[PDB]
Scaffold this active site. Structure first.
Site, PDB file in Angstrom:
ATOM      1  N   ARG A  13       1.007  -1.486   0.116  1.00 38.12           N
ATOM      2  CA  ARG A  13      -0.173  -0.231  -0.192  1.00 38.12           C
ATOM      3  C   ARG A  13       1.008   1.217  -0.481  1.00 38.12           C
ATOM      4  O   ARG A  13       1.870   1.198  -0.696  1.00 38.12           O
ATOM      5  CB  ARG A  13      -0.761  -0.619   1.632  1.00 38.12           C
ATOM      6  CG  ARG A  13      -1.960  -1.372   0.999  1.00 38.12           C
ATOM      7  CD  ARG A  13      -2.583  -1.712   1.913  1.00 38.12           C
ATOM      8  NE  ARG A  13      -3.278  -0.459   2.570  1.00 38.12           N
ATOM      9  CZ  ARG A  13      -4.887   0.233   2.464  1.00 38.12           C
ATOM     10  NH1 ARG A  13      -5.013  -0.449   1.375  1.00 38.12           N
ATOM     11  NH2 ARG A  13      -5.297   1.468   3.111  1.00 38.12           N
ATOM     12  N   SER A 137      16.484  14.076   7.141  1.00 38.99           N
ATOM     13  CA  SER A 137      14.727  14.491   7.740  1.00 38.99           C
ATOM     14  C   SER A 137      13.972  13.061   8.482  1.00 38.99           C
ATOM     15  O   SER A 137      14.687  11.906   7.890  1.00 38.99           O
ATOM     16  CB  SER A 137      14.444  15.204   6.330  1.00 38.99           C
ATOM     17  OG  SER A 137      14.040  14.141   5.848  1.00 38.99           O
ATOM     18  N   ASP A 143      -2.754  12.459   9.714  1.00 36.67           N
ATOM     19  CA  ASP A 143      -3.949  12.436   8.970  1.00 36.67           C
ATOM     20  C   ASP A 143      -4.739  13.422   9.075  1.00 36.67           C
ATOM     21  O   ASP A 143      -4.821  14.022   9.803  1.00 36.67           O
ATOM     22  CB  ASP A 143      -4.733  11.450   9.353  1.00 36.67           C
ATOM     23  CG  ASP A 143      -6.140  11.076   9.528  1.00 36.67           C
ATOM     24  OD1 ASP A 143      -6.632  10.977   8.643  1.00 36.67           O
ATOM     25  OD2 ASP A 143      -6.454   9.798   9.600  1.00 36.67           O
ATOM     26  N   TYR A 156      -7.296   5.420  18.176  1.00 38.24           N
ATOM     27  CA  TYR A 156      -6.678   5.473  16.958  1.00 38.24           C
ATOM     28  C   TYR A 156      -6.511   7.203  17.011  1.00 38.24           C
ATOM     29  O   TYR A 156      -4.924   7.816  16.630  1.00 38.24           O
ATOM     30  CB  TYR A 156      -7.551   5.293  15.796  1.00 38.24           C
ATOM     31  CG  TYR A 156      -6.567   5.723  14.053  1.00 38.24           C
ATOM     32  CD1 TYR A 156      -5.413   5.410  13.737  1.00 38.24           C
ATOM     33  CD2 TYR A 156      -7.257   7.139  13.528  1.00 38.24           C
ATOM     34  CE1 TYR A 156      -4.812   5.832  12.675  1.00 38.24           C
ATOM     35  CE2 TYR A 156      -6.890   7.147  12.424  1.00 38.24           C
ATOM     36  CZ  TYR A 156      -5.719   6.619  12.196  1.00 38.24           C
ATOM     37  OH  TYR A 156      -4.845   7.236  11.048  1.00 38.24           O
ATOM     38  N   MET A 158      -6.363   9.596  18.853  1.00 37.52           N
ATOM     39  CA  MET A 158      -5.293  10.119  20.082  1.00 37.52           C
ATOM     40  C   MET A 158      -3.792   9.471  19.427  1.00 37.52           C
ATOM     41  O   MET A 158      -3.118  10.919  19.302  1.00 37.52           O
ATOM     42  CB  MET A 158      -5.820   9.821  20.955  1.00 37.52           C
ATOM     43  CG  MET A 158      -7.200  10.161  22.002  1.00 37.52           C
ATOM     44  SD  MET A 158      -7.240   8.710  23.476  1.00 37.52           S
ATOM     45  CE  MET A 158      -6.405   8.755  24.201  1.00 37.52           C
ATOM     46  N   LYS A 160      -2.790   9.632  16.865  1.00 35.42           N
ATOM     47  CA  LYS A 160      -2.475  10.167  15.297  1.00 35.42           C
ATOM     48  C   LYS A 160      -2.286  11.915  15.863  1.00 35.42           C
ATOM     49  O   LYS A 160      -1.679  12.528  15.886  1.00 35.42           O
ATOM     50  CB  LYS A 160      -3.043  10.737  14.009  1.00 35.42           C
ATOM     51  CG  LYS A 160      -3.364   9.164  12.975  1.00 35.42           C
ATOM     52  CD  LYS A 160      -1.762   8.469  13.439  1.00 35.42           C
ATOM     53  CE  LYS A 160      -1.728   7.542  11.871  1.00 35.42           C
ATOM     54  NZ  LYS A 160      -0.428   7.512  10.802  1.00 35.42           N
TER      55      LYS A 160
HETATM   56  N1  LIG Z   1      -4.710   4.066   3.353  1.00 31.82           N
HETATM   57  C1  LIG Z   1      -5.497   6.114   3.969  1.00 31.82           C
HETATM   58  O1  LIG Z   1      -6.571   6.520   3.223  1.00 31.82           O
HETATM   59  C2  LIG Z   1      -4.590   7.112   5.004  1.00 31.82           C
HETATM   60  C3  LIG Z   1      -5.844   7.856   4.847  1.00 31.82           C
HETATM   61  C4  LIG Z   1      -5.033   8.702   6.204  1.00 31.82           C
HETATM   62  C5  LIG Z   1      -3.604   8.691   7.114  1.00 31.82           C
HETATM   63  N2  LIG Z   1      -3.225   7.529   6.039  1.00 31.82           N
HETATM   64  C6  LIG Z   1      -1.982   7.232   7.105  1.00 31.82           C
HETATM   65  O2  LIG Z   1      -0.879   6.732   5.835  1.00 31.82           O
HETATM   66  C7  LIG Z   1      -0.151   5.016   7.004  1.00 31.82           C
HETATM   67  C8  LIG Z   1      -0.144   3.963   6.012  1.00 31.82           C
HETATM   68  O3  LIG Z   1      -1.661   3.792   5.476  1.00 31.82           O
HETATM   69  P1  LIG Z   1      -1.954   2.503   4.921  1.00 31.82           P
HETATM   70  O4  LIG Z   1      -3.452   2.562   4.862  1.00 31.82           O
HETATM   71  O5  LIG Z   1      -0.969   2.328   4.066  1.00 31.82           O
HETATM   72  O6  LIG Z   1      -1.682   1.672   5.953  1.00 31.82           O
HETATM   73  P2  LIG Z   1      -1.968   0.045   6.443  1.00 31.82           P
HETATM   74  O7  LIG Z   1      -1.886  -0.937   5.218  1.00 31.82           O
HETATM   75  O8  LIG Z   1      -3.274   0.565   7.344  1.00 31.82           O
HETATM   76  O9  LIG Z   1      -0.712   0.008   7.379  1.00 31.82           O
HETATM   77  C9  LIG Z   1       0.220  -0.193   6.607  1.00 31.82           C
HETATM   78  C10 LIG Z   1       1.273  -1.140   8.150  1.00 31.82           C
HETATM   79  O10 LIG Z   1       1.521  -0.453   8.743  1.00 31.82           O
HETATM   80  C11 LIG Z   1       1.973  -2.221   9.684  1.00 31.82           C
HETATM   81  N3  LIG Z   1       1.839  -2.787  11.388  1.00 31.82           N
HETATM   82  C12 LIG Z   1       0.186  -1.787  11.796  1.00 31.82           C
HETATM   83  N4  LIG Z   1       0.160  -2.833  12.887  1.00 31.82           N
HETATM   84  C13 LIG Z   1       1.686  -2.871  13.023  1.00 31.82           C
HETATM   85  C14 LIG Z   1       2.791  -3.015  14.215  1.00 31.82           C
HETATM   86  N5  LIG Z   1       1.782  -4.108  15.052  1.00 31.82           N
HETATM   87  N6  LIG Z   1       3.659  -3.401  14.321  1.00 31.82           N
HETATM   88  C15 LIG Z   1       4.041  -3.118  13.027  1.00 31.82           C
HETATM   89  N7  LIG Z   1       3.503  -3.177  11.500  1.00 31.82           N
HETATM   90  C16 LIG Z   1       2.400  -2.247  11.837  1.00 31.82           C
HETATM   91  C17 LIG Z   1       1.369  -3.223   8.489  1.00 31.82           C
HETATM   92  O11 LIG Z   1       2.499  -3.749   8.431  1.00 31.82           O
HETATM   93  P3  LIG Z   1       2.809  -5.346   7.596  1.00 31.82           P
HETATM   94  O12 LIG Z   1       1.803  -5.896   6.834  1.00 31.82           O
HETATM   95  O13 LIG Z   1       3.820  -5.929   7.473  1.00 31.82           O
HETATM   96  O14 LIG Z   1       2.196  -6.477   8.928  1.00 31.82           O
HETATM   97  C18 LIG Z   1       0.713  -2.449   7.881  1.00 31.82           C
HETATM   98  O15 LIG Z   1       1.222  -3.551   6.038  1.00 31.82           O
HETATM   99  C19 LIG Z   1      -0.395   5.406   7.837  1.00 31.82           C
HETATM  100  O16 LIG Z   1       0.533   5.433   8.651  1.00 31.82           O
HETATM  101  C20 LIG Z   1      -1.811   5.895   7.633  1.00 31.82           C
HETATM  102  O17 LIG Z   1      -2.495   5.853   9.162  1.00 31.82           O
HETATM  103  C21 LIG Z   1      -3.621   6.186   5.824  1.00 31.82           C
HETATM  104  C1  LIG Z   2     -12.189   5.720   4.346  1.00 35.76           C
HETATM  105  C2  LIG Z   2     -11.386   5.617   4.937  1.00 35.76           C
HETATM  106  C3  LIG Z   2     -10.823   4.325   5.650  1.00 35.76           C
HETATM  107  C4  LIG Z   2      -9.337   4.571   6.515  1.00 35.76           C
HETATM  108  C5  LIG Z   2      -8.396   4.565   5.644  1.00 35.76           C
HETATM  109  C6  LIG Z   2      -7.148   5.554   7.192  1.00 35.76           C
HETATM  110  C7  LIG Z   2      -7.601   6.690   7.826  1.00 35.76           C
HETATM  111  N1  LIG Z   2      -5.780   6.590   8.423  1.00 35.76           N
HETATM  112  C8  LIG Z   2      -5.584   4.894   7.998  1.00 35.76           C
HETATM  113  N2  LIG Z   2      -4.237   4.134   9.215  1.00 35.76           N
HETATM  114  C9  LIG Z   2      -4.539   2.962   8.757  1.00 35.76           C
HETATM  115  N3  LIG Z   2      -3.203   2.913   9.179  1.00 35.76           N
HETATM  116  N4  LIG Z   2      -5.160   3.116   8.086  1.00 35.76           N
HETATM  117  C10 LIG Z   2      -6.259   2.929   7.036  1.00 35.76           C
HETATM  118  N5  LIG Z   2      -6.637   2.523   5.865  1.00 35.76           N
HETATM  119  C11 LIG Z   2      -6.787   4.275   7.713  1.00 35.76           C
HETATM  120  C12 LIG Z   2      -9.105   6.237   5.864  1.00 35.76           C
HETATM  121  C13 LIG Z   2     -10.470   6.345   5.084  1.00 35.76           C
END
Ligand SMILES: NC(=O)c1ccc[n+]([C@@H]2O[C@H](COP(=O)([O-])OP(=O)(O)OC[C@H]3O[C@@H](n4cnc5c(N)ncnc54)[C@H](OP(=O)(O)O)[C@@H]3O)[C@@H](O)[C@H]2O)c1
Ligand SMILES: Cc1ccc(-c2c[nH]c3nc(N)nc(N)c23)cc1
Ligand SMILES: NC(=O)c1ccc[n+]([C@@H]2O[C@H](COP(=O)([O-])OP(=O)(O)OC[C@H]3O[C@@H](n4cnc5c(N)ncnc54)[C@H](OP(=O)(O)O)[C@@H]3O)[C@@H](O)[C@H]2O)c1
Ligand SMILES: NC(=O)c1ccc[n+]([C@@H]2O[C@H](COP(=O)([O-])OP(=O)(O)OC[C@H]3O[C@@H](n4cnc5c(N)ncnc54)[C@H](OP(=O)(O)O)[C@@H]3O)[C@@H](O)[C@H]2O)c1
Ligand SMILES: NC(=O)c1ccc[n+]([C@@H]2O[C@H](COP(=O)([O-])OP(=O)(O)OC[C@H]3O[C@@H](n4cnc5c(N)ncnc54)[C@H](OP(=O)(O)O)[C@@H]3O)[C@@H](O)[C@H]2O)c1
Ligand SMILES: Cc1ccc(-c2c[nH]c3nc(N)nc(N)c23)cc1
Ligand SMILES: Cc1ccc(-c2c[nH]c3nc(N)nc(N)c23)cc1
Ligand SMILES: Cc1ccc(-c2c[nH]c3nc(N)nc(N)c23)cc1
Lengths: 250, 251, 250, 249
Positions: A13, A137, A143, A156, A158, A160
């Site tokens: 991802r 850096s 988020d 979650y 808290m 962030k």
């Molecule tokens: N996706 C979105 O739309 C979105 C929105 C807002 C913010 N964000 C932020 O952007 C970043 C990436 O989002 P994403 O959706 O790509 O993330 P994600 O798929 O939810 O998680 C990313 C990776 O985090 C690792 N992780 C989870 N729990 C863990 C643990 N206990 N110890 C170590 N690693 C762990 C996992 O690694 P493994 O698979 O190797 O276990 C997972 O593959 C995050 O910080 C997220 O909060 C994303």
């Molecule tokens: C509709 C929707 C669903 C999830 C996320 C998301 C926010 N922060 C997140 N952080 C992690 N580690 N995974 C996610 N999938 C999210 C944002 C929008």
């Protein structure tokens, strides 16, 4: 010499996209993973086919515990071992799930996972990164919806918010060492694998710019800007990459 | 019947002032404390002499650990046990000390204390407060007006106060359907640390645009009393700065 | 076909550096100016020597008045008249001077100048930009110290606050047309010409990251990012370029 | 002796409620109005019936123009003429209507009205208030300022400038002992003409009670900020929004 980067949660991802782009920019990369060993290695295999010995993997649970500091220190050390230097830390790994205030992991395990992955591990990694020391850096994945959070996502949220506090505190304190500390705040990027398609379209339709989610590459683009020489005066800044979503009233 | 409040870290300083003002407003009070047993009892004595059976003390460590949830449940249960209800929760107790990123307690103890007191215990006390309901219910979190201009080398403390901002907002949203409002009060410079020397205290006082002085404990307590009152019944998710303009002052 | 950009207040200092980097990136540029006629024409010469017919000047007062809409419309028209298109607008022109609340222009002139240049003109240029219409975007030059303002600068601060509001409102309203609207917020960059040396050095010493002001080029780097292909999902964001200054308590 | 307050746009709705509560608290009041003369006068007559010689009215257009500084000085001066003092200034009057970026009033009239009422007039009233000196100013802001109404650019710019004023004036007038704060409603009294079905749409978004704030609830937060209980509070803007601003799209 090529600079080196650690990206946490880099197997899939957004983290994968970020590792791939840094590598394309000339970085050598440590691909951290927790459960996704197969995907981490296949990424490293792909990156090492392009340029030999420029990608390694590193396993660790980032849940808070008595051993988390040691684990964080070893993530940083693994970059030094593989590449002799550590220029960039990307704090991307993140647990995400509901924790309702009113009603089977215990609540304290949820605190450990949600607050550890999103805040405490980033702090400890930040400590180790700075201790073990150019264009240095750190980039924290934040988020864009922190002030209009998901319902029943207290912990979650808290975690962030704490990560925002870390970004600011660390920018301030590490500026004298030349280490910048910034954030990238996605809104709706790649939706959760588990989310049903109808619900995915519902979120997409909220986004003013294009009525779609950000790709992982578009998030990675902001990280690349932040670690570049084009951002040498930028610290303490968190760039939203949300298509205007956070501007949309209820 | 008189409403009831729990104030964490209420033995002295701002917590004490909030308890006293809640008491003067007609609340029965749980004075939570950790190490300040003597000050807590001395407070409860004074309040009970003013109106008998309107104050009890409650000891608890609010460091994070696997039993912190039961400790927080017990704090709320002690209000119901003493007074038969719990109308207000004030999250005041707070650990505060530097945790430098680049160089005593282990770092995991610092995390447990600074994040536990400032964020996790408020979150668990919120859960428990909400769970026990079963009117003007509210929670007031003691925040920090300098959260975006933080004290140098106070990473974990700042993380904890930021996290508390997030709880305030998340809980305001989630508990609104139950009629529980959740707000915050954010001091800038109020009662300076007991151990700080006078010269250092004055350097801070001189920064404050409004009167070149720190907020009294009472002035902090005033904003808490406002937020719990019927004059704030439509207010939820708000954090009121009580800082004499300090956070507006550039470096 | 090379894109075209309007930069207001482009004769000197930050505006100049922006126009130069945009030009180096491939843009044709309208160099807007008010009084700096010689520097404007000299900059156009410089750029036109590099690629012929890629820069023109455009003079206008951006003080608020009943003719400001026409003036703003003309600035945009001048970009279409020179280059056949207008892809980027950079709102940089800005009046800046104290307006004490308690006691040689009139207060209504100070209002017109400060609020006009920092807020009204950007709003009218945005209207005309959108009305005349790809990677279209707008970048507003904001101020990282907007919540820790300079003493006795009420009207200026009001203007920059208004500018944040515009950035947000315009990002939201123009997102359906594919026009992104963002900002760059300097802290201490090029110091006032009329400021004395000791005072300049006092401000430099406050900046955590390097104890110096941003160069005009560092500010322009962030503009270049926001207009680029690497910022395509970014709208409504304001990037601080302040070396950590806004994180520093009194 | 009784303190005195100027409330702008006090003839109706939220400004009216503010003026009544200030009066119930012991303030003598200047009821500023623009077009609503009949309502401003009946309010004045009501308050003077409750206590003689405690309410006056003052008419003025707060649109930006060459004469707005004189108009704002006059409003302040009218408080001094009526009551010998001016302790509180409440900036409430506000023009509010859409100004779309892409397409009888010209755009410069909209600018003068929206930016004048919401920002410049408050600024001029503040200078006049301060020049003539528990003193405070309360500015009526908007909790939705970062999630704005679609096509309300100029309005939103006006309210943002108002936040800036609140902060700038708090800093600058603190040495004189003048506090400067805001109250930010989300959804409070809805437009008079609005269909119930549209009103209900908005009410349902509000986490706390699924209703708008009464004008009185807005006024309560004004009364707190002007009181002795807010003596250390300056530069603070209190949201009174039932959690609306925390609700994602
Ligand atoms: N996706 C979105 O739309 C979105 C929105 C807002 C913010 N964000 C932020 O952007 C970043 C990436 O989002 P994403 O959706 O790509 O993330 P994600 O798929 O939810 O998680 C990313 C990776 O985090 C690792 N992780 C989870 N729990 C863990 C643990 N206990 N110890 C170590 N690693 C762990 C996992 O690694 P493994 O698979 O190797 O276990 C997972 O593959 C995050 O910080 C997220 O909060 C994303
Ligand atoms: C509709 C929707 C669903 C999830 C996320 C998301 C926010 N922060 C997140 N952080 C992690 N580690 N995974 C996610 N999938 C999210 C944002 C929008
Ligand atoms: N003082 C200021 O100027 C200022 C500035 C900004 C924010 N604030 C906030 O306002 C609130 C009150 O400030 P304050 O200066 O009065 O606080 P304080 O004196 O630093 O601490 C308040 C109480 O916290 C309790 N506490 C500390 N560690 C604990 C633990 N591990 N378990 C349980 N309780 C613990 C202590 O209780 P015992 O004494 O019983 O052990 C202490 O009396 C705090 O949340 C603070 O962060 C204050
Ligand atoms: N320098 C900093 O440290 C700093 C800090 C924070 C924010 N910023 C923001 O970044 C941008 C650039 O800063 P700067 O220091 O380079 O700006 P500046 O030199 O103060 O002003 C730039 C230009 O604005 C134009 N201008 C002023 N009044 C005008 C009017 N009535 N009509 C039309 N144009 C007018 C002037 O053009 P002519 O010279 O042609 O008359 C001037 O050269 C500004 O928006 C500023 O507010 C700068
Ligand atoms: N209602 C809400 O839900 C809401 C939401 C967010 C913020 N607010 C803020 O709260 C305050 C009060 O809101 P409201 O709904 O009660 O306001 P409103 O009814 O929309 O306006 C209040 C008064 O403002 C005056 N006004 C308008 N244009 C003027 C001009 N050119 N010169 C002088 N006065 C002028 C009018 O006085 P005359 O009638 O005498 O002509 C009007 O009665 C405003 O500042 C508003 O922005 C309200
Ligand atoms: C000059 C000065 C010194 C300390 C504090 C303080 C902030 N947060 C705090 N939290 C606690 N639990 N205690 C404190 N004493 C503070 C604020 C300004
Ligand atoms: C010490 C110092 C002096 C000025 C500026 C500045 C802020 N905004 C500004 N806006 C404009 N149009 N010009 C400026 N020169 C500034 C920042 C720090
Ligand atoms: C659904 C709705 C409609 C309008 C208002 C309103 C915001 N700001 C406002 N400012 C003024 N001067 N009047 C208003 N009526 C509003 C809020 C929610």
């Amino acid at each position: 010499e090529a600079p080196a980067a650690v990206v946490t949660g880099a197997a899939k991802r957004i983290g994968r996209a970020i590792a791939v782009k840094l590598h394309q920019t000339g970085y050598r990369v440590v691909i951290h993973y927790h459960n996704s060993a197969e995907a981490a290695v296949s990424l490293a295999d792909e990156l090492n086919k392009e340029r030999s010995n420029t990608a390694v993997v590193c396993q660790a649970d980032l849940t808070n515990s008595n051993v988390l500091p040691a684990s964080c220190e070893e993530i940083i050390n693994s970059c030094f071992r593989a590449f002799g230097r550590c220029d960039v830390l990307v704090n991307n790994a993140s647990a995400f799930y509901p924790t309702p205030l009113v009603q089977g992991k215990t609540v304290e395990t949820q605190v450990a996972e949600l607050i550890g992955t999103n805040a405490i591990a980033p702090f400890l990694l930040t400590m180790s990164f700075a201790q073990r020391q150019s264009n240095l850096s750190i980039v924290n994945l934040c988020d864009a919806m922190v002030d209009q959070p998901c319902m029943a996502f207290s912990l979650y949220n808290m975690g962030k918010h704490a990560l925002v506090g870390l970004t600011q505190s660390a920018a301030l304190e590490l500026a004298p060492y030349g280490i910048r500390v910034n954030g990238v705040a996605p809104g709706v990027s790649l939706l959760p694998v588990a989310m049903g398609e109808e619900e995915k379209d519902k979120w997409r339709r909220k986004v003013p710019l294009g009525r779609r989610e950000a790709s992982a590459e578009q998030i990675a683009d902001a990280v690349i800007f932040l670690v570049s020489g084009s951002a040498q005066y930028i610290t303490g800044s968190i760039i939203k990459v949300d298509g205007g979503l956070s501007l949309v009233h209820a």
